[PDB]
Structure 1
Amino acid sequence: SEFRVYSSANNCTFEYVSQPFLMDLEGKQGNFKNLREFVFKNIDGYFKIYSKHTPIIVREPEDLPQGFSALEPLVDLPIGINITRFQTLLALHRSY
């Protein structure tokens, strides 16, 4: 029952599924962190997704790493609805 983000439904318009955007795995070992990036663009009734992942090893929660990296597109979305606000989500099961 983790789908606590939404409780009510309505008519749906687009139901694409694919491989998860976060393919980085922590099962190898620790001591390095992920650097997920995402750029969202909504123009002429379209939507684009760009993402890259690189290791950092050192955490240093102060600033982004000093390095250049290209960001290739992942998927293109043909939904042409108005967008004005951004909201993110978290994963929290219980106190532990």
Structure 2
Amino acid sequence: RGWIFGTTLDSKTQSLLIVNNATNVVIKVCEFQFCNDPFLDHKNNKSMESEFRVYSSANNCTFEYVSQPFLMDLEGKQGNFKNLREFVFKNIDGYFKIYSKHTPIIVREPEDLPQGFSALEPLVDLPIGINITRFQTLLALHRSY
């Protein structure tokens, strides 16, 4: 979880972040000072809700968006099946578009993507006006257990 964007990934330029807690997306367009190796905690790190450690400051804020999570996938059914989440991020003329589509997988081999046609339905449109030149992803590591 997490797709922070930025021109140089520091407090002097605005940045994005896509954090799905359990039921929200928390879209935040603000100036953030980022740690060297930001990460999160899968098991809510106990807490309360004290996992967030990506940013250490916020000088200014311009855009906010909270809604249902991008991930409708649920693992509570059973195991033996993995996910095939797909996203395309396109940023033009001061707009940010997100497309998504999920399908189940049968073969346990992760070496190659399965051969099959998939249509990526549009999900959400963003009116923010940031420049993006670098890409960074985030991870959820609660504890070694």
TM-score (norm 2): 0.64
Displacement, 1:72?
0.7
- Following TM superposition, the consecutive aligned residue runs of length 4 or more in structure 1 with deviations greater than 3 angstroms are none
Distance across 2 between alignment mates of 1:37 and 1:6: 26
Contact in 2 for aligned 1:31/1:58 (Cα 8 Å): no
Unaligned runs of 5+ in 2: 1-49
State the Cα deviation string for residues 49-79 of structure 1 (Å, max 9, x = none).
Answer: 0000000022211100100000011000001
For the residues of structure 2 that align with 1:24 and 1:42, how far apart are their CA atoms?
Answer: 25
CA distance in 1: counterparts of 2:87 and 2:59, whole angstroms = 28
- Aligned partners of 1:35, 1:60: CA distance in 2, in Å? 12
The CA distance in 1 between the partners of 2:62 and 2:87, in whole Å, is: 24
Contact 1:37 1:52 survives alignment (8 Å) = yes
Q: Which runs of 5+ in 1 are unaligned?
A: none
RMSD across aligned positions (CA) = 0.8
Greater relative contact order (Cα < 8 A, sep 6+): 2
Deviation at 1:94, TM superposition (A): 1.3
Distance 1:50 1:59 in 2: 25
User: 1: distance between equivalents of 2:108 and 2:54?
Assistant: 30
Distance 2:58 2:130 in 1: 17
Asked whether the 8 Å contact 1:49–1:74 carries over to 2, the reply is yes
Greater strand fraction, Structure 1 or Structure 2: 2
CA contact (8 A) 1:32 1:57 kept: yes
Q: TM-score, normalised by structure 1?
A: 0.96
Task: Report the counterpart of residue 120 of structure 2 in structure 1.
Answer: 71
